[PDB]
């Protein structure tokens, strides 16, 4: 029964570390999302194939 209480509380605790790393991952997602914004400001203008049909004809 000590084990039953242990598994109750430790199930709780592993679910809790679950939610904690879940918040870590959610904030990785959101902060890295605003960081996608930050670095996109810098890198999007070149995601393009340019100066191909300029001369070939």
């Amino acid at each position: 029964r000590q084990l039953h209480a242990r598994v109750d509380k430790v199930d709780e605790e592993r679910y809790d570390i679950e939610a904690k790393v879940t918040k870590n991952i959610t904030e990785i997602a959101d902060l890295t999302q605003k960081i996608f914004d930050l670095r996109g400001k810098f890198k999007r203008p070149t995601l393009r194939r340019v100066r191909i049909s300029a001369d070939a004809m």
Partner: peptide
């Protein structure tokens, strides 16, 4: 003359 805490609690507890 006549919420969110509930949901996360459900998660952990179940």
């Amino acid at each position: 003359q006549n919420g969110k805490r509930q949901t996360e609690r459900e998660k952990k507890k179940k």
